[PDB]
């Protein structure tokens, strides 16, 4: 076997990397976690340190709060029985209020209120994490791209659980918490709307979703392939193009007749990915608020 750089042949270990201080309040980094040899065949061996600020803690707490809320309703649905719980794990489902309560918070705890409670914990957990996304970047003087991109994931999630239920007039329109139910909600959502294959935004979304597997497979292979000239050090190849970046561009140019720069290909990346949910969320947003059947709409576009 000639060698492929998929796993490492040697791990090498130094002092724990505490990382650049920049405008970061170091009060808040934890200290280093331990070192997984296992992780280290593949990527980095070192776990931690993590930073937890006040916003940090907030997010992570309501995080667990949502998880723990879903989880009692599951133990309850299991009637407190540990073996039943394990057995019926994918079957338990925490559902939203019935269509009757509309958008009200009135619904009893045991038929929708528990849902909104968990939904409330999820909403502050996600959004706080979001601002955590930006803040960690500010402290380091990095650009804002992670938060912008994370905003695209949030837009679908937003439209699914909140924007769309409001616009349609009730919380029953939104998605159960549970492994099978959310699958069922999905399949079901499509049926009620005329099959999402006829919704042009769905189709676009697939093109990007598949497209991201294409791009990353291309890109990840391209790098591993030029990794024998230090290709993986993309930022310094951006600052000072080396043979790795050249031989990369020219693979794609000789194959398909155009190519990227080491920096550009990352902008293909961020967009290919972000467009998946951007596009998706427009597609759901419009479902049933503006088009009740995609087939029908499709029949005479306008």
């Amino acid at each position: 076997a000639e060698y492929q750089n998929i796993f490492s042949q040697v791990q090498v270990r130094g002092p724990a990397d505490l990382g650049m201080t920049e405008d970061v309040n170091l009060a808040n980094r934890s200290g280093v976690g331990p070192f997984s040899t296992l992780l280290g065949w593949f990527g980095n061996a070192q776990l931690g340190p993590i930073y937890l600020g006040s916003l940090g803690v907030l997010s992570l707490f309501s995080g667990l709060m949502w998880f723990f809320t879903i989880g009692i309703w599951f133990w309850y649905q299991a009637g407190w029985n540990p073996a039943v719980f394990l057995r019926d794990l994918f079957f338990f489902s925490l559902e939203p209020p019935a269509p009757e309560y509309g958008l009200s918070f009135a619904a009893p705890l045991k038929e929708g209120g528990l849902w909104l409670i968990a939904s409330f914990f999820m909403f502050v957990a996600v959004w706080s994490w979001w601002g955590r996304t930006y803040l960690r970047a500010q402290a380091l003087g990095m650009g804002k791209h992670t938060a912008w991109a994370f905003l695209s994931a949030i837009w679908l999630w937003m439209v699914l659980g909140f924007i769309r239920p409001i616009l349609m007039g009730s919380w029953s329109e939104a998605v159960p918490y549970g492994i099978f139910s959310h699958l069922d909600w999905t399949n079901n959502f499509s049926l009620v709307h005329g099959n999402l294959f006829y919704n042009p935004f769905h189709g676009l979304s697939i093109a990007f979703l598949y497209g991201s597997a294409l791009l990353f497979a291309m890109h990840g292979a391209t790098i591993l392939a030029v990794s024998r000239f230090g290709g993986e050090r993309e930022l310094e190849q951006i600052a000072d193009r080396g043979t790795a970046a050249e031989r990369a561009a020219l693979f794609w140019r000789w194959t398909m007749g155009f190519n990227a720069t080491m920096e550009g290909t990352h902008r293909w990346a961020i967009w290919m990915a972000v467009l998946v949910t951007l596009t998706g969320g427009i597609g759901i947003l419009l479902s049933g608020t503006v088009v009740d059947n995609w087939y029908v709409w499709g029949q005479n576009h306008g």
Binding site: N5, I6, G19, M20, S30, G33, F42, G43, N44, P49, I50, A78, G79, N81, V84, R87, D88, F91, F92, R132, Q138, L140, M142, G143, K144, H145, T146, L183, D184, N195, F197, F208, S212, A213, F216, A217, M218, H219, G220, A221, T222, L224, A225, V226, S227, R228, R233, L235, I238, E246, A249, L250, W254, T255, G257, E263, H266, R267, A269, A273
Partner: protein, 281 residues
């Protein structure tokens, strides 16, 4: 015709077949021997689709559609218009894709870089071949294959999945879909990380991998790192397609009932089948 740093690499050699015979470029395109294979297979197959498009009555790409032989024909050939055009176009398709990979191997050799790209492409080729050749052969007919039309092949996706109820319950399809999703997550993250370092705050100087490592650890207590993430993209991608093929090679061959039903192996275990309470007692 050339990129500014390009001449120095345009040297003779690396070919797989043909020696120096088809070793040249046309505009930016390298020409394999396999560049010549691909053009022949791809132009023949396009010609046969344009052909087929008249035998069928339309010139509109949203209508052109080429269907496999009907189930009745089993594994045999089938007249040109009753499915054989499809049989020949599929042979062109495979011919054209396998050439493309082999052409990519040749480009790899001239350039002194590794074989990762075509190896990766190969998983796509295998997925296609799973839909149009492996699965139909394990099942008895070319007619289980999908047809070549923009909108008619989604017809085939709906029809095929709905033969097992909600396809969501196909457990390999679940793992596949997880791989796809995680892949798009890694793609968003990698892109935005690298850009956020090369394009920092403003007036500010370019960040370093130490920054990229640092931001990640700050956010989630971990960073896989710059070699890591490219290995991961590759793995996530390829794993997605591998479980894509696996979920389809097994559907209709070793499992052919309603996928939702498979799950009963779990719920029906001795230790708890008959305990009462919860959703299944």
């Amino acid at each position: 015709a050339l990129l500014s740093f390009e001449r120095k690499y345009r040297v003779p050699g690396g070919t797989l077949v043909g020696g120096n015979l088809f070793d040249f470029w046309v505009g930016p395109f390298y020409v394999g021997f396999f560049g010549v294979a691909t053009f022949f297979f791809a132009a023949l197959g396009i010609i046969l689709i344009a052909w087929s498009a008249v035998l069928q009555g339309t010139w509109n790409p949203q209508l052109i559609s080429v269907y496999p032989p009907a189930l009745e024909y089993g594994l045999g050939g089938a007249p040109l218009a009753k499915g054989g055009l499809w049989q020949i176009i599929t042979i062109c398709a495979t011919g054209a894709f396998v050439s493309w990979a082999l052409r990519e191997v040749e480009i790899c050799r001239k350039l002194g870089i590794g074989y990762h790209i075509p190896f990766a492409f190969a998983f796509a080729i295998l997925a296609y071949l799973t839909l149009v050749l492996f699965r139909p052969v394990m099942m008895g007919a070319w007619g289980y294959a999908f047809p070549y039309g923009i909108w008619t092949h989604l017809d085939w996706v709906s029809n095929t999945g709905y033969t097992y109820g909600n396809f969501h319950y196909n457990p390999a399809h679940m793992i596949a879909i997880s791989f796809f999703f995680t892949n798009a997550l890694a793609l968003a993250l990698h892109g935005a990380l690298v850009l956020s370092a090369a394009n920092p705050e403003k007036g500010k100087e370019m960040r370093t991998p130490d920054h990229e490592d640092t931001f990640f650890r700050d956010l989630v207590g971990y960073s896989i790192g710059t070699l890591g993430i490219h290995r991961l993209g590759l793995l996530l991608s390829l794993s997605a397609v591998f479980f894509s093929a696996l979920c389809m090679i097994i559907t209709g061959t070793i499992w052919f009932d309603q996928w939702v039903d498979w799950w009963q192996w779990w719920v029906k275990l001795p230790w708890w089948a008959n305990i009462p309470g919860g959703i299944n007692g």
